[PDB]
Amino acid sequence: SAFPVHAAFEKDFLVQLVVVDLNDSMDQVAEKVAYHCVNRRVAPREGVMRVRKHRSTELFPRDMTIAESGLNPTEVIDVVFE
């Protein structure tokens, strides 16, 4: 089911509403955010996109789902590269 987040993508200028799914993996979450940023205001690049709570030092595992993460709807996440 629908799960709204506010996402900040690495090297973009803003935070955006992105609706993901409760059982999306973090990899799927990053791609849903990237849709609204890469090749729009952010240059594409090589590397693995990772998801974290905003400003956090820890990254969510790539295969962890939104349900498994403990995130709440409307919390803020970053999408950053290794």
- Write 33-37 long-range contacts (CB < 8 A, 24+): 33/7, 33/9, 33/77, 33/79, 34/9, 34/79, 36/9, 37/9, 37/12, 37/79
Cα gap 54→78, rounded to integer Å = 5
Residue closer to other proteins by CB (options 43, 58) is 43
Cα gap 43→19, rounded to integer Å = 22
Residue closer to other proteins by CB (options 18, 66) is 18
Q: How far is the CB of 63 from other proteins (least distance, A)?
A: 25
Binding site for other proteins (CB under 8 A): 4, 6, 8, 10-18, 35-36, 39-43, 54-55, 72, 74-76
Residue closer to other proteins by CB (options 63, 81) is 81
Q: How far is the CB of 37 from other proteins (least distance, A)?
A: 10
